[PDB]
Design a protein around this ligand. Structure first.
Ligand SMILES: [Mg+2]
Ligand SMILES: [Mg+2]
Ligand SMILES: [Mg+2]
Ligand SMILES: [Mg+2]
Ligand SMILES: [Mg+2]
Ligand SMILES: [Mg+2]
Ligand SMILES: [Mg+2]
Ligand SMILES: [Mg+2]
Ligand SMILES: [Mg+2]
Ligand SMILES: [Mg+2]
Ligand SMILES: [Mg+2]
Ligand SMILES: [Mg+2]
Ligand SMILES: [Mg+2]
Ligand SMILES: [Mg+2]
Ligand SMILES: [Mg+2]
Ligand SMILES: [Mg+2]
Ligand SMILES: [Mg+2]
Ligand SMILES: [Mg+2]
Ligand SMILES: [Mg+2]
Ligand SMILES: [Mg+2]
Ligand SMILES: [Mg+2]
Ligand SMILES: [Mg+2]
Ligand SMILES: [Mg+2]
Ligand SMILES: [Mg+2]
Ligand SMILES: [Mg+2]
Ligand SMILES: [Mg+2]
Ligand SMILES: [Mg+2]
Ligand SMILES: [Mg+2]
Ligand SMILES: [Mg+2]
Ligand SMILES: [Mg+2]
Ligand SMILES: [Mg+2]
Ligand SMILES: [Mg+2]
Ligand SMILES: [Mg+2]
Ligand SMILES: [Mg+2]
Ligand SMILES: [Mg+2]
Ligand SMILES: [Mg+2]
Ligand SMILES: [Mg+2]
Ligand SMILES: [Mg+2]
Ligand SMILES: [Mg+2]
Ligand SMILES: [Mg+2]
Ligand SMILES: [Mg+2]
Ligand SMILES: [Mg+2]
Ligand SMILES: [Mg+2]
Ligand SMILES: [Mg+2]
Ligand SMILES: [Mg+2]
Ligand SMILES: [Mg+2]
Ligand SMILES: [Mg+2]
Ligand SMILES: [Mg+2]
Ligand SMILES: [Mg+2]
Ligand SMILES: [Mg+2]
Lengths: 122, 113, 54, 214, 118
RNA sequence: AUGGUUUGGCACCUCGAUGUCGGCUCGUCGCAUCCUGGGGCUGGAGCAGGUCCCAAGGGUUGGGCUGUUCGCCCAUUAAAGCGGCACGCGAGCUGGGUUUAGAACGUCGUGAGACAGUUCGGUCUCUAUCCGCCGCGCGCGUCAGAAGCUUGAGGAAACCUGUCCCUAGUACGAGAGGACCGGGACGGACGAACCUCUGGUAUACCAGUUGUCCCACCAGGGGCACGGCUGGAUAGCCACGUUCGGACAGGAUAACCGCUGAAAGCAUCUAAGCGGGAAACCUCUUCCAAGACCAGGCUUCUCACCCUCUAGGAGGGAUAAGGCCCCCCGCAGACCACGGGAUUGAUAGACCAGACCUGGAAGCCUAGUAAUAGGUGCAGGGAACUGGCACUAACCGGCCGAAAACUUAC
């Protein structure tokens, strides 16, 4: 439920606050991006001395969305506002933490580091 | 007349603790990793029930860091290790729809006395 | 749009050929000593004796 | 072989797995079907079994239908519908007047359910064939939501039979293939299926062994 | 009842509510009333509702009927005569009978009346 | 040499009117194929290529820029095909420029004006007759008449694919790197279906609230002010929601690969024969389908009372099976059609019971001078949901609707 031109909160210690969704990767005319999808985002505003300055183009893995997300037992989970995470070719997050909860689907997605160092997984 | 009352019974789990929209609860998510099971902890706010024979249906949802989180699960959930409704509660209805937008000091779940 | 020409007499009348009225079968009721004509739509009221038939 | 059964949808529900998941399910009460005729190839032209199920007051049932049922030797049934066989092997195991029940299905066997679709009434093109709505502003003139261009121009100078445009949709036979079975009732003829089969509460649904997978 | 499916009778919720209130008022004030049968079928639910509410005579119930029909005369008559008058019978207090189609617009006409047999 | 697509030539059709570029919606076809499929060769170790052959089943980006087509750029995918179709499509829409009337700039002209130079704003009409097409009905014939069930000629629909693991870091390669065929799982877009979950909507549900008018007064309620504004949600409908699908297999083939083989002691995939061989064809899957006039097949019910004409055939009645109308109606529906029921009955509506929603009715009482709070209590109220209830409405029922035959074998 993350779309082109959608604002995203940053859930990492890079120095990013607001970013734009470039697209949803891995699909011809793919149209939505929910938690677990590797999507491409651009930095719109960032910390002055942060690790990445605005205008850079980086890939992100969406984690926190205002749209519910299913799970095996029919569980639907709503969050307060969409949140992404910055990542590069090796699929290693460019930050060293995460603020706010996260979703268990990342473990399935094999981004072990994120959920392993997350403050809490739900 | 829900001709499935008698097929519902064939799988309906006994000892159904009561739970009300707007109670504080916890759940356990039996998850397998490397062919191994485990138990975790989680808090939530059952927002709605939908009783259905064996289809009595509901979820849960918590708050943290100024944000919310849920879990949806059976009345007779074999995944919920125990539906430990923390403190019995009520709310303005049986279902908290406006809970998706209240922020700060607006969105909690009342505790009855 | 409009027509390109006159539609033949026969064509117009053929189109007309299925637009007509129909006649039903009436019903008599013996109430109050009199038999009046009412479509079965009314038969029970006819028997009871309150239907406004001249 | 290519067994078959009629049944009704009375609602639809979900069950909670021993696999520990949750699955939606539809209530297809499979009343006991009764064989009221045989289709022997040598004397009819093919192999198949006649089926009927239900209850109708004798005055509600036509005289010829009642006579046919009597000659069959079974009580009146609410409708009649017959399924086909694939070989005389299954044929030899069926016999006029025999009663058939939901027992015939062993769990884990994919199934196919088909029946009349919902009554949608006449439908606009956009809803029917999933068109896209035009620009509803920037100056549409009573054309916010209509089909639009319809073919070539003087070549082919026609409108190409088959073009998908407005036409009353729904309310026709439809089938859903490869639906996992979930629980077979025995005492009171009930059958639970994952998914959402077509039809309507109180509608008529015919189930049969799945074709694709098995 | 079940909702008036097509373009509803009058063409607005307020108009329907009013029209029906006045219709019921007239029906109880007179005891029999001739109108277009479709309006009769639509009205039947409201008259039956009011009769049931009259079934028991209390301050709450009469406030209810006042809010519903807004005519103190008809409320009084309903609660004083019809209410007790229909204690024994249970449901189906009115009877719909059709009459000749109206001349002005041919619209089907049906005479409606409360069951006066009991 | 081919095609007729670009720039062109001719002026044969149209000046008593053939609306023009783009965009939008919708598409349809060809194949000189973009990917997906199958092959030949490589300067083909492998991966990854290059090239040519068969193949049109399916699919084939979104944005910034400009009116743009185009093109560049950014970033994805397997790909971002080339074209024909009045440079597809204004009696389907837009008018952004082209293309009137004002004005202006530069330029040409003494000039009025002009400039396939630029710049700002500038009326887009039609109730579908016919063909056509998407659906739904009426009439008749199917050879006594009816209710059902079909077989199936014959049409239609669908046909896409990515990623990851195992074989295996093995064959291959010095190393770097990294196989083929084959399975399994999870994905994108697309389609069908559905309301269980999550949600949307919710105008007979409820409540809060401003103004006002009204109901004799107040207390309480109602009218109106986009529902007066708001917050909730029944059912139903629906998608973001969930289930499923694209096959497997088979037959005959393309290109291609072959075996045994003389013409021509050899050689030779071939002229005799026999084989393999792909999303291409025919079936397999689903839907329509006996108006299939070649009108099919299988059951069950009514299958004999007349008259007359002038006996040749025909005209006037009898009806049952069943149908129609009628009534109540449906999740069926534009009207029609279809489905259900019509007393020996649950079709509808009330009723009861419940669920559900709303969340604490009014009245009284108590505390507070009050605005209010609590009890009376899980209050009151309650559409479309679940079961039963003849209480009302659907009937002492009318009307349509029974066999010329000929020839042959047994
Ligand atoms: Mg649809
Ligand atoms: Mg649209
Ligand atoms: Mg206009
Ligand atoms: Mg408009
Ligand atoms: Mg010329
Ligand atoms: Mg000419
Ligand atoms: Mg001319
Ligand atoms: Mg002109
Ligand atoms: Mg034009
Ligand atoms: Mg043009
Ligand atoms: Mg070719
Ligand atoms: Mg290839
Ligand atoms: Mg090559
Ligand atoms: Mg091709
Ligand atoms: Mg195809
Ligand atoms: Mg073309
Ligand atoms: Mg053109
Ligand atoms: Mg075109
Ligand atoms: Mg063109
Ligand atoms: Mg037009
Ligand atoms: Mg036209
Ligand atoms: Mg112009
Ligand atoms: Mg101009
Ligand atoms: Mg000028
Ligand atoms: Mg000058
Ligand atoms: Mg000059
Ligand atoms: Mg202007
Ligand atoms: Mg114009
Ligand atoms: Mg016009
Ligand atoms: Mg016309
Ligand atoms: Mg065929
Ligand atoms: Mg919603
Ligand atoms: Mg909604
Ligand atoms: Mg309303
Ligand atoms: Mg007042
Ligand atoms: Mg007052
Ligand atoms: Mg009050
Ligand atoms: Mg008012
Ligand atoms: Mg208004
Ligand atoms: Mg509001
Ligand atoms: Mg819906
Ligand atoms: Mg040779
Ligand atoms: Mg050789
Ligand atoms: Mg026939
Ligand atoms: Mg009959
Ligand atoms: Mg509620
Ligand atoms: Mg109800
Ligand atoms: Mg009901
Ligand atoms: Mg007659
Ligand atoms: Mg003859």
């Amino acid at each position: 439920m993350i779309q082109q031109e959608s604002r995203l909160k940053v859930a990492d210690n890079t120095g990013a606050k607001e970013i734009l969704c470039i697209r949803v990767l891995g699909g011809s005319s793919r149209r939505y991006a929910g938690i677990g999808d590797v999507i491409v985002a651009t930095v719109k505003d960032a910390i002055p001395g942060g690790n990445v300055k605005r205008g850079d183009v980086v890939k992100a893995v969406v984690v926190r969305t205002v749209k519910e997300r299913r799970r095996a037992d029919g569980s639907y989970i709503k969050f307060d506002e969409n949140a992404a995470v910055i990542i590069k070719n090796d699929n290693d997050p460019r930050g060293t933490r995460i603020f706010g909860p996260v979703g268990r689907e990342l473990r399935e997605k094999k981004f072990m580091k994120i959920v392993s160092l997350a403050p809490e997984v739900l | 007349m829900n001709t499935l009352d008698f097929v519902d019974q064939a799988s309906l789990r006994d000892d159904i603790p009561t739970f009300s929209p707007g109670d504080t609860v916890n759940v356990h998510v039996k998850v397998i990793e490397g062919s191994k099971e485990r138990i975790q902890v989680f808090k939530g706010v059952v927002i709605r029930r939908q009783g259905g024979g064996i289809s009595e249906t509901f979820t849960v949802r918590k708050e943290s860091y100024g944000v919310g989180v849920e879990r949806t699960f059976p009345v007779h959930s074999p995944n919920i290790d125990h539906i430990d409704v923390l403190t019995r509660g009520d709310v303005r209805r049986a279902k908290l729809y406006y809970l998706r937008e209240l922020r700060g000091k607006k969105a909690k779940i009342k505790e009855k006395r | 749009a409009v027509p390109k020409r006159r539609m033949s007499r026969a064509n117009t009348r053929s189109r007309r050929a299925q637009w007509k009225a129909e006649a039903p079968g009436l019903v008599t009721v013996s109430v109050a000593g009199q038999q009046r004509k009412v479509p079965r739509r009314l038969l029970k009221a006819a028997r009871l004796g309150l239907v406004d038939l001249d | 072989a290519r067994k078959g059964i009629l049944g009704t949808k009375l609602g639809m529900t979900q069950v909670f797995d021993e696999n520990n998941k949750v699955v939606p399910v539809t209530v297809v009460k499979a009343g006991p079907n009764v064989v009221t005729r045989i289709r022997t190839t040598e004397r009819d032209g093919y192999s198949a079994v006649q089926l009927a199920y239900g209850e109708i007051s004798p005055r509600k049932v036509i005289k010829p239908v009642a006579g046919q049922f009597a000659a069959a030797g079974v009580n009146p049934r609410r409708h009649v519908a017959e399924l086909r066989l694939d070989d005389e092997a299954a044929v030899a195991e069926y016999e006029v007047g025999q009663e058939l029940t939901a027992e015939i299905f062993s769990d884990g066997a994919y199934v196919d359910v088909t029946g009349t679709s919902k009554g949608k009434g006449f439908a606009g093109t956009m809803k029917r064939h999933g068109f896209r709505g035009q620009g509803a502003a920037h100056g549409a003139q009573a054309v916010h939501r209509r089909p639009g261009s319809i073919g070539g121009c003087a070549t082919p100078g026609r409108v190409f039979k088959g073009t998908r445009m407005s036409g009353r949709m729904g309310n026709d036979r439809v089938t859903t293939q490869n639906l996992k079975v979930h629980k077979v009732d025995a005492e009171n003829g009930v059958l639970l299926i994952k998914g959402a089969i077509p039809g309507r509460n109180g509608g008529l649904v015919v189930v049969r062994s799945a074709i694709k997978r098995g | 009842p079940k909702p008036t499916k097509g373009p509803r009778l009058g063409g607005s919720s307020s108009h329907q509510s009013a029209l029906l209130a006045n219709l019921a008022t007239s029906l109880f004030e007179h005891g029999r009333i001739k109108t277009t049968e479709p309006k009769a079928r639509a009205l039947r639910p409201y008259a039956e509702k009011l009769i049931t509410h009259a079934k028991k005579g209390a301050l709450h119930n009469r406030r209810e009927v006042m809010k519903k029909i807004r005519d103190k005369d008809v409320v009084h008559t309903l609660f004083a005569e019809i209410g007790p008058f229909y204690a024994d019978r249970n449901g189906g207090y009115t009877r719909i009978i059709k009459v000749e189609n109206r001349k002005g617009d041919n619209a089907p006409m049906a005479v409606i009346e409360l069951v006066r047999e009991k």
